[PDB]
Design a protein around this ligand. Structure first.
Ligand SMILES: Nc1nc2c(ncn2[C@@H]2O[C@H](COP(=O)(O)OP(=O)(O)OP(=O)(O)O)[C@@H](O)[C@H]2O)c(=O)[nH]1
Ligand SMILES: [Mg+2]
Lengths: 570, 163, 415, 13, 131
C-alpha cells in the first residue's frame, strides 16, 4: 500500500518514482493523511525533470507545518536549484522557498533570495519581489536585518513594468504590516514613474499600482489634476476590478480638487458611466459594485442622481443583488422620479421572496420619509397593497403606515377609515402594536374605536410586551379624548394591567396612568394628549468621520460590510 | 362516455336515482356524505354519473367535480316548497361558473307522490329556468321509486351528447 | 488578496485545494458548506460568508464552488475577478469545467494554481500565452510573460492574414405590465477572431459620436457610445486623448470592446400578452408578436418563452406561424418561430386546464422573455469604418466583419 | 458560424 | 455608376416633393463590401452630376441629404456620411476630400468648384480639426 509506494519511491528507474510521486499528490488531492511519507518523497526531488519538481515542491508546500523538523532536508536543494540557467526552475524554487512556513528554514533562505532579487531574467525577479513579502509575513525583523526593503524599493526604479507591479504589491503588503515607522511613500516624480508604468503592465498590475495611490494624497490642485488625468483612462477597462480601483483612487483624489474649476464637473461626468456599467457584469461582481455605489452616493450624490433606471431589479437577479438595488433605489429617490420608484416597488411586492417583499415595503416607507411631496401616493400604494389580503404584506404595510403617520401627522384622516375595516385577525406582534397605535392616536376619526379594542382585550395577559403596553397607552388616550363611551373600559384595562399583570414596565405605566387619572384627569389632556415634538428621523447616512476613511477602502471587505477595517478582522 | 353529475339538495332521491338507473331496485340508502359513482350504460352511452350528496357541509366541495363535466342533473325535490328558494339559489350560484360552462342541464322533478308535489311547470317558474343563457336546460319529471321518466330523461340526454 | 483557492463541488468535498499564504487553515473548507446551507435556508445568502474571522469569497460554476478564503481586509473585486479568470483559464484548457476534469487533470491544475497566483496576488492569467510553458502534453517562460505586450507571443506566422470581427449587439429590454418601456439599453460586444502574422498594430475606427464631433461631422449617422470598456490590449491613453482605438491583438478569440448605449426607439419584438385566468378552471394566452424592425431583415429562431402556471395541464395551441412546445421542466411555453420577418405579426392562442383544488403556495410572475437573433442588423447603428493593419514586415491583410443582434435579458413583465 | 462576413477597408486615413 | 441611373429621377422626385424647410434599426446589405466614397469615386460622381444633370442650382436641405445618403448606401455600398458640409457661418463648404461643389445661400444651392478636390477650402475654414 504505502510501503510498496515507498518501495517504488526508492527505485532506480524514473518511470516508477514519477508514478509514485503522481500517486502521492493524487492521494493528497482526495484528502489522505500522507504526511507520514514525507522524508521519502524528498529523496525523489533532485531530478532532471521539471514536470516532476512542481509536484514535489507542492508536497513540500503542503506538508511542512506537520513535518517541521523533517523539512530541513530541502534547504540545500533550494539553494542548489537557485543557480540553474533555466529561469522557470529558479522562479519555481523562489516561489516555493517563501511558502514553506518553518522557522528553522527562513533564516537560511535569505541568501539565494538576495541573489535572485538582483537576478537578470525578469520572471524570477517578479517572483522574488512577492517572495520578499512572503518572508516578511513569517519573520518580521529578519528581512530588515537582511535589508530587503532597500532592494525592494529599487525594483520600482527599474523598467519592465510587471516587476514594478509585483514590487509595489509586495511593498504595500509590507507597509501595511509595519506600525508606519519608516513609511514607504515617495515623491511625485516616483508617482510619474508609476503612472508611466501603469499603461504598460498587465491587467492585474494596474490594480496593485492603483492600490499604491490609495495611500498617497497630493498637496495642490494642478498636482491632483495631473494624476487624475492619468488615472482617469482606466475607467475604460473591461476587468471590473481595475475600474473599481480607479474609482477608489478618483474618489480619494477628488477631495483635493477645486469646485470652482471645470475639472470637477468633467470628472463627475466621466465617473458615472463606469459605475453604471459595472452593473452589466457577472452577478457576484454586482454585489461589490452595488455596495460601493452605496458607499459613493452617500459621499458624492452629484454623480448618480440621473440614473434610477439601471437600478431596477430584474426577476432573475439573485437575492443578494435584489436586496441591494432596493437600497440604492432608496438612496436616489427624489421629486423627479417618485412615480418610477413607486410603480417599481408596487411590482416588487407581488413576489414570493418574502425577504425581498418585506424589503420592498420598507423601501416604500423609507422613500415616503425621504420625499414629502409623494407620501399621499405612498399611502395610496400601501393601501392598494393592503386591499389584496396577503398576510406578510399587510403585516409590513401596517408598520409602514405607522412610520408615516408619526412623520406626517396632519392630513391623513381619510385613510384610517379604510384601516378600521382590516379584519383584526392580524397576527405578528410588530404589526399589532402599529394597529393599536393608529387606533389610539387618531381616535376621533375612528368613530367606533371603543368597540374594536375589546377584541384586543380578551387575551391581555399573554400577548407580548409591545401589544400590552400599546393597549395601555391607546385606551387611556381614547378615554382622555372621549370619557363618555369608554368609562368602564379604562377601569377594566387598569384592573387588567395593574392587578393580574406581572410585567414591571406594564405595572409602572399602569400605576402612573391610574394615579394620573384619579389625581387630575383635566390636567392629563396637557400631560399625555400632548403635541409631540417633531420626530428626528434615523439618519442612515454613515458618519463622515468614518465615511472619509471608507472611501479609501472601496472594493474591499471594508466597504461591502460598511464597517471600518478593524471591527471585523482578527 | 359522458361525465355526469347529480347535484342538488339533501333528501332529493339522488342516490335512489343512481341505484335505480344502474341496478334497478330501491336500495335502502344512508344520507350519502361523500359521493358515489356507477357507470350507467344506457342508449349505448356509458353515463359516468358522479352522484354527490347535498348536505350543508358538502355543497362547497362541488367545485372539485365541475371539470370535464359534459352535463349536470340538478335533482330538485317536488315536496319541498321551502327549499326551492335555496334550490334556485344553488342553481344560480353554480351555473354561472367558468368551469362547467358547456354542460347541459337535466333537471329532475323527483318524488312525485303527493298533491303537495308540483309538476314541471311550477318547478320551472320557481327555479326560473327561462332566465338561463347558453343553456340546453330540460326539465324532466321523474319518479325514482318507480323508474317513471328516468330512462326518458337519459334518452333526451343521449340525444344531446353529439351535435 | 486571496488566501487559499479551493475548488469545491456540489456536496462540500474538495476536488482540489491550494493555499497561498497559510493564513487560513486547510480544514476551514469543511465549515463552508454548512454555512452556505444555513445562510441559504434563511434567505441571507451572499457571496461573502463569515466563519468567525475567515471570509469565504466564492463563485458558483456548473458543479464547482470556487471558494477562495481570506482573513484580512481582502480586496474583493480582485478576488472575484481572479475567480472568474480561473474559470476562464480552466475553460480554455478543459473545454467544459465539471468534476470530471478536476479529478483527471491534477497533473496540470496544481501547476496552474502554482502559476496564476503567488501569495494572493494574481500575476499571469492570459491563457493563450499560458499554453506555452504549462501544457498537458518545460522550456523557458516566454518574453511575453516579461514584456509590456503580455498577451501576444512574437513570431506567430500564418499563410493567410485574416481578421474576423463580430459586432454582436444585445438588446436589453424590461417592459412593465402597463405597456410602457422601462429599461431599453443595448450592450454591444465587438468580439474579434484574429489571425495575423507578427506583432501588428491595428487601429480600429468606429463611427463614434465624439470622434465625429471632434472631426466636424456631427450631423450624419453616429452611434453614441455612452460607456466603452475595452480589452487590456487597447492603449487607453490614446483613446482618452482623441478617441483612437489602437491595439496589438492577441491570437484567437477575445472580446475587444464592450460598449453600452441606451435607446429611446421602439423595441424590436413586442409581445402583447393577455391572460384569461379563471380561477380553478383554465387559462388562455392571446399573445401577439409584432416585429417592429425593418422589412428586410429576418429574425432567425425567435423563442418567445411565456410563463404558464406551474400546474397547468392538457394544453391546446392555435398559432399562426411557428411551432409551440410546452416545456414543463421550466413551466413555460416556448413558442418558437424559425423565420420571423420584420413588419409581420404572428398570433398565438394557448389554452390550458387548471387543477380544481387550489395550490398550496403562491408562485410569482416571471417575465415573457424572447430569444431572438437578427443577423446583418445593428440596432444602435454602429458601423465599423476601417481597420488599419500596421506591420513592420508589411503585408495586405484581409479584415472582415459581420453584424448580429441578439437578446440580452429581453424580458417583458406579465399580468 | 453559419453567417457570412463583409470586407471592411484598410487605409481610410 | 450604373445602378444610380434608374433612381436618378425617382429619388430626385422624392427629394423635390420633400419640403426643404413601424420601423427601428439599421440593416446592412449581406456580403456586398463597404467602402467610403473615395477620391476617384468622388470625381466620377462629380462627372456623373455634371453630365447627367439635375442637381446644379437646386435647393439644398438636410432631409434631401439623408434620403440620398441612405439611398446611396442601400444601392451602391458606400458609407452615408460622405455628404458632409460645414455649419452656418461662411459658405457651407464640403468636408469630404473630393466633393467639387460648394453650397452658397440662395436654404442652399450648389456651385461648381474644380479645386475642392485638392485645395481643401474646408480645411482653410476648419484648420485645427484636420491635423
Ligand atoms: N315517495 C318517494 N320517496 C323518495 C323517492 N326518492 C327518494 N325518496 C325518499 O327520500 C329519502 C332520501 O333518499 P336517498 O336517495 O336515499 O337520500 P338522498 O336523497 O340521496 O340524500 P343525499 O344522498 O344526501 O343527497 C329516502 O329515504 C326515500 O324514502 C321517490 O322517488 N318517491
Ligand atoms: Mg344519497
Amino acid at each position: 500500500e504505502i510501503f510498496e509506494l515507498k518501495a517504488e519511491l526508492n527505485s532506480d528507474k524514473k518511470e516508477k518514482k514519477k508514478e509514485a510521486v503522481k500517486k502521492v499528490i493524487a492521494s493528497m488531492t482526495v484528502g489522505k493523511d500522507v504526511s507520514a511519507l514525507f522524508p521519502d518523497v524528498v529523496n525523489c526531488m533532485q531530478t532532471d525533470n521539471l514536470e516532476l519538481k512542481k509536484l514535489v515542491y507542492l508536497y513540500l508546500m503542503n506538508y511542512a507545518k506537520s513535518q517541521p523538523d523533517m523539512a530541513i532536508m530541502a534547504v540545500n536543494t533550494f539553494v542548489k536549484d537557485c543557480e540553474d540557467p533555466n529561469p522557470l526552475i529558479r522562479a519555481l524554487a523562489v516561489r516555493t522557498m517563501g511558502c514553506i512556513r518553518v522557522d528553522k528554514i527562513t533564516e537560511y533562505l535569505c541568501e539565494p533570495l538576495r541573489k535572485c532579487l538582483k537576478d537578470e531574467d525578469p520572471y524570477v525577479r517578479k517572483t522574488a519581489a512577492v517572495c520578499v513579502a512572503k518572508l516578511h509575513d513569517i519573520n518580521a525583523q529578519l528581512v530588515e536585518d537582511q535589508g530587503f526593503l532597500d532592494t525592494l524599493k529599487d525594483l520600482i526604479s527599474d523598467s519592465n513594468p510587471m516587476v514594478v507591479a509585483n514590487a509595489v504589491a509586495a511593498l504595500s503588503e509590507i507597509a501595511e504590516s509595519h506600525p508606519s515607522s519608516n513609511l514607504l511613500d515617495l515623491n511625485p516624480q516616483s508617482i510619474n514613474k508609476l503612472l508611466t508604468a501603469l499603461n504598460e503592465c498587465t491587467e492585474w498590475g494596474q490594480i496593485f499600482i492603483l492600490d499604491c495611490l490609495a495611500n498617497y494624497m497630493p498637496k495642490d490642485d494642478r498636482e491632483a489634476q495631473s494624476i487624475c488625468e492619468r488615472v482617469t483612462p482606466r475607467l475604460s477597462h473591461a476587468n471590473s476590478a481595475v475600474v473599481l480601483s480607479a474609482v477608489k483612487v478618483l474618489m480619494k483624489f477628488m477631495e483635493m480638487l477645486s469646485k470652482d474649476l471645470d475639472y470637477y464637473g468633467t470628472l463627475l461626468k466621466k465617473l458615472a458611466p463606469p459605475l453604471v456599467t459595472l452593473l452589466s457584469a457577472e452577478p457576484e461582481l454586482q454585489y461589490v459594485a452595488l455596495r460601493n455605489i452605496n458607499l459613493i452616493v452617500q459621499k458624492r450624490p452629484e454623480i448618480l442622481k440621473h440614473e434610477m433606471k439601471v437600478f431596477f431589479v430584474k426577476y432573475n437577479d439573485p437575492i443578494y443583488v435584489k436586496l441591494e438595488k432596493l437600497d440604492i433605489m432608496i438612496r436616489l429617490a427624489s421629486q423627479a422620479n417618485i412615480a418610477q420608484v413607486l410603480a417599481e416597488l408596487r411590482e416588487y411586492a407581488t413576489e414570493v421572496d418574502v425577504d425581498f417583499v418585506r424589503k420592498a415595503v420598507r423601501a416604500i416607507g423609507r422613500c415616503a420619509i425621504k420625499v414629502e411631496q409623494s407620501a399621499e401616493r405612498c399611502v395610496s400604494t400601501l393601501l392598494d397593497l393592503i386591499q389584496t389580503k396577503v398576510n406578510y404584506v399587510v403585516q409590513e404595510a401596517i408598520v409602514v403606515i405607522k412610520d408615516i403617520f408619526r412623520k406626517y401627522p396632519n392630513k391623513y384622516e381619510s385613510v384610517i377609515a379604510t384601516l378600521c375595516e382590516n379584519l383584526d385577525s392580524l397576527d405578528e406582534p410588530e404589526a399589532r402594536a402599529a394597529m393599536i397605535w393608529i387606533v389610539g392616536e387618531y381616535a376621533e376619526r375612528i368613530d367606533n374605536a371603543d368597540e374594536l379594542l375589546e377584541s384586543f382585550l380578551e387575551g391581555f395577559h399573554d400577548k407580548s410586551t409591545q401589544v400590552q403596553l400599546q393597549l395601555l397607552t391607546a385606551i387611556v388616550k381614547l378615554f382622555l379624548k372621549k370619557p363618555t363611551e369608554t368609562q368602564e373600559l379604562v377601569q377594566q384595562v387598569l384592573s387588567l394591567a395593574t392587578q393580574d399583570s406581572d410585567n414591571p414596565d406594564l405595572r409602572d405605566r399602569g400605576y402612573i396612568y391610574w394615579r394620573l387619572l384619579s389625581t387630575d384627569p383635566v390636567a392629563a389632556k396637557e400631560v399625555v394628549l400632548a403635541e409631540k415634538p417633531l420626530i428626528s428621523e434615523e439618519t442612515d447616512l454613515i458618519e463622515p468621520t468614518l465615511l472619509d476613511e471608507l472611501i479609501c477602502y472601496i472594493g474591499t471587505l471594508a466597504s461591502v460590510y460598511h464597517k471600518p477595517p478593524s471591527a471585523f478582522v482578527e | 362516455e359522458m361525465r355526469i353529475l347529480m347535484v342538488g339538495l339533501d333528501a332529493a332521491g339522488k342516490t335512489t336515482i343512481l341505484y335505480k338507473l344502474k341496478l334497478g331496485e330501491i336500495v335502502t340508502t344512508i344520507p350519502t356524505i361523500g359521493f358515489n359513482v356507477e357507470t350507467v350504460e344506457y342508449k349505448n352511452i356509458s353515463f359516468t354519473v358522479w352522484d354527490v350528496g347535498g348536505l350543508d357541509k358538502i355543497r362547497p366541495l362541488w367545485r372539485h367535480y365541475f371539470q370535464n363535466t359534459q352535463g349536470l342533473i340538478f335533482v330538485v325535490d317536488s315536496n319541498d316548497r321551502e327549499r326551492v328558494n335555496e334550490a334556485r339559489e344553488e342553481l344560480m350560484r353554480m351555473l354561472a361558473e367558468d368551469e362547467l360552462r358547456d354542460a347541459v342541464l337535466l333537471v329532475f322533478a323527483n318524488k312525485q307522490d303527493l298533491p303537495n308535489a308540483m309538476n314541471a311547470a311550477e318547478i320551472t317558474d320557481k327555479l326560473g329556468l327561462h332566465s338561463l343563457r347558453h343553456r340546453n336546460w330540460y326539465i324532466q319529471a321523474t319518479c325514482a321509486t318507480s323508474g317513471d321518466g328516468l330512462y326518458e330523461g337519459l334518452d333526451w340526454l343521449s340525444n344531446q351528447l353529439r351535435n | 488578496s486571496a488566501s487559499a483557492v479551493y475548488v469545491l463541488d456540489l456536496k462540500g468535498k474538495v476536488l482540489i485545494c491550494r493555499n497561498y499564504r497559510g493564513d487560513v487553515d486547510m480544514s476551514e473548507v469543511e465549515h463552508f458548506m454548512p454555512i452556505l446551507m444555513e445562510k441559504e435556508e434563511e434567505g441571507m445568502l451572499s457571496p461573502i460568508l463569515a466563519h468567525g474571522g475567515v471570509r469565504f469569497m466564492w463563485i458558483k460554476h456548473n458543479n464547482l464552488y470556487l471558494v477562495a478564503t481570506s482573513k484580512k481586509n481582502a480586496c474583493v473585486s480582485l478576488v472575484f475577478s481572479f475567480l472568474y479568470k480561473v474559470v476562464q483559464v480552466f475553460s480554455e484548457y478543459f473545454k467544459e469545467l465539471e468534476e470530471e476534469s478536476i479529478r483527471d487533470n491534477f497533473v496540470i491544475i496544481y501547476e496552474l494554481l502554482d502559476e496564476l497566483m503567488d501569495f494572493g496576488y494574481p500575476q499571469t492569467t492570459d491563457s493563450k500565452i499560458l499554453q506555452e510553458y504549462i501544457t498537458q502534453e518545460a522550456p523557458r517562460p516566454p518574453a511575453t510573460v516579461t514584456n509590456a505586450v503580455s498577451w501576444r507571443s512574437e513570431g506567430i506566422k500564418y499563410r493567410k492574414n485574416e481578421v474576423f470581427l463580430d459586432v454582436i449587439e444585445a438588446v436589453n429590454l424590461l417592459v412593465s405590465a402597463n405597456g410602457n418601456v422601462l429599461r431599453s439599453e443595448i450592450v454591444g460586444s465587438i468580439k474579434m477572431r484574429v489571425f495575423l502574422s507578427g506583432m501588428p498594430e491595428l487601429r480600429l475606427g468606429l463611427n463614434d459620436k465624439v470622434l465625429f464631433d471632434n472631426t466636424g461631422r456631427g450631423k450624419s449617422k453616429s452611434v453614441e457610445l455612452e460607456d466603452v470598456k475595452f480589452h487590456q490590449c487597447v492603449r487607453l491613453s490614446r483613446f482618452e486623448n482623441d478617441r483612437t482605438i489602437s491595439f496589438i491583438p492577441p491570437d484567437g478569440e477575445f472580446e475587444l470592446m464592450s460598449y453600452r448605449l441606451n435607446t429611446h426607439v421602439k423595441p424590436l419584438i413586442w409581445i402583447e400578452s393577455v391572460i384569461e385566468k379563471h380561477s380553478h378552471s383554465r387559462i388562455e394566452y392571446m399573445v401577439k408578436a409584432k416585429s417592429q424592425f425593418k422589412r428586410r431583415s429576418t429574425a432567425n429562431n425567435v423563442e418567445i418563452h411565456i410563463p404558464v402556471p406551474n400546474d397547468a395541464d392538457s394544453p391546446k395551441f392555435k398559432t399562426t406561424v411557428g411551432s409551440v412546445k410546452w416545456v414543463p421542466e421550466n413551466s413555460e411555453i416556448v413558442w418558437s418561430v424559425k423565420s420571423f420577418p420584420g413588419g409581420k405579426e404572428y398570433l398565438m392562442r394557448a389554452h390550458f386546464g387548471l387543477p380544481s383544488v387550489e395550490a398550496e403556495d403562491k408562485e410569482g410572475k416571471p417575465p415573457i422573455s424572447v430569444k431572438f437573433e437578427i443577423p446583418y442588423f445593428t440596432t444602435s447603428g454602429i458601423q465599423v469604418r476601417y481597420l488599419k493593419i500596421i506591420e513592420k514586415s508589411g503585408y495586405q491583410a484581409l479584415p472582415w466583419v459581420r453584424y448580429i443582434t441578439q437578446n440580452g435579458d429581453y424580458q417583458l413583465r406579465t399580468q | 458560424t453559419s453567417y457570412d462576413y463583409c470586407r471592411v477597408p484598410m487605409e481610410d486615413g | 455608376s450604373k445602378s444610380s441611373v434608374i433612381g436618378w429621377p425617382a429619388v430626385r422626385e422624392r427629394m423635390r416633393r420633400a419640403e426643404p424647410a413601424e420601423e427601428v434599426g439599421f440593416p446592412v446589405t449581406p456580403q456586398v463590401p463597404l467602402r467610403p466614397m473615395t477620391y476617384k469615386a468622388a470625381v466620377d460622381l462629380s462627372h456623373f452630376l455634371k453630365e447627367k444633370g439635375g442637381l446644379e442650382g437646386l435647393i439644398h436641405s438636410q432631409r434631401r441629404q439623408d434620403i440620398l445618403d441612405l439611398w446611396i448606401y442601400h444601392t451602391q455600398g458606400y458609407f452615408p456620411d460622405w455628404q458632409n458640409y460645414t455649419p452656418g457661418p461662411g459658405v457651407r463648404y464640403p468636408l469630404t476630400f473630393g466633393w467639387c461643389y460648394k453650397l452658397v445661400p440662395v436654404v442652399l444651392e450648389w456651385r461648381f468648384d474644380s479645386r475642392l478636390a485638392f485645395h481643401h477650402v474646408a480645411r482653410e475654414l476648419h484648420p485645427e480639426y484636420f491635423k
